[PDB]
C-alpha cells in the first residue's frame, strides 16, 4: 500500500461582521487581562513502561518531585507491536496496521490487572488510613471470595 | 533572572482564583453576552474549579 499527496491546501471560514464590531473586539483582546486560555481534555504526562513477556509485576519508581496540583492516575495495558513511537518520526519496526489502542481509545486489556500498590517515601501506603477494606493495596480482582470481597 | 522561581502565575493560568467574568474587562463581558447567539466566545476563557 502506498499513499501520495498532490494538493495539501488550507481553508478558513470567517464570520462576516461590521468593521466597527470587529475592531472593538480586537482592542478588547489586546489587553493581557483578556488573554485567552485553553487546556487539553486529557491533560496528562504519558509514560510507557515495558512489561517483559510473562512478567507478573512492574515496579515504577519516580524521583522526589513536588505534587502540587496533582489529580489522579489512569492505567491500561497496550502491546509492544501495536504501539509505535511518536518521538521518532522514523519507525521501521512497526509491522502492525490494525487498530492502535494508544492513539485511539480502543483499550481491551483492563481485566489483566490484579493489584496496584501506591506508596510515598517507600513507607507510607497512600489510601492506608484504613479507607479500603483491604487497606494497604487496591486489588482490581481476586480469585476466591475470602468472605465475599 | 533569579527572582521568578515561583508561580503566582498558577492564577495567571486560570486553575485557581477568579472566574471569567471577573478577570475579563467589563467591556468584553458586555460584548460576550450580547453576541452568543451567532458567535460564541465562551470557550476561549478558562474557569477554575477548586
Amino acid at each position: 500500500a502506498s499513499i501520495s499527496f498532490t494538493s495539501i491546501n488550507l481553508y478558513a471560514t470567517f464570520f462576516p461582521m461590521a468593521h466597527n464590531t470587529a475592531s472593538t473586539l480586537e482592542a478588547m483582546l489586546r489587553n493581557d487581562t483578556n488573554d485567552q486560555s485553553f487546556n487539553d481534555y486529557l491533560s496528562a504526562a504519558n509514560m510507557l513502561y515495558p512489561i517483559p513477556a510473562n512478567a507478573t509485576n512492574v515496579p515504577i519508581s519516580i524521583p522526589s518531585r513536588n505534587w502540587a496540583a496533582f489529580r489522579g492516575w489512569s492505567f491500561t495495558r497496550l502491546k509492544t507491536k501495536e504501539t509505535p513511537s511518536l518521538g521518532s518520526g522514523f519507525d521501521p519496526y512497526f509491522v502492525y496496521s490494525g487498530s492502535i489502542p494508544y492513539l485511539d481509545g480502543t483499550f481491551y486489556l483492563n481485566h489483566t490487572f490484579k493489584k496496584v500498590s501506591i506508596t510515598f517515601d517507600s513507607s507510607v501506603s497512600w489510601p492506608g488510613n484504613d479507607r479500603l477494606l483491604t487497606p494497604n493495596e487496591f486489588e482490581i480482582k481476586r480469585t476466591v471470595d475470602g468472605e465475599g470481597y | 533572572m533569579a527572582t521568578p522561581s515561583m508561580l503566582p502565575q498558577w492564577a495567571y493560568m486560570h486553575i485557581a482564583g477568579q472566574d471569567a467574568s471577573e478577570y475579563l474587562s467589563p467591556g468584553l463581558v458586555q460584548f460576550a453576552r450580547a453576541t452568543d447567539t451567532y458567535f460564541s466566545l465562551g470557550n476561549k476563557f478558562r474557569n477554575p474549579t477548586v
Partner: peptide, 21 residues
C-alpha cells in the same frame, strides 16, 4: 431540549458608545 428554532437576542452588538471626534 426539544427546540428547533433559535432565539434572537433582540439587541445589537455593543451597548457601549463612543463620541464623534
Amino acid at each position: 431540549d426539544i427546540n428547533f428554532s433559535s432565539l434572537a437576542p433582540r439587541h445589537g452588538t455593543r451597548p457601549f458608545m463612543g463620541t464623534w471626534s
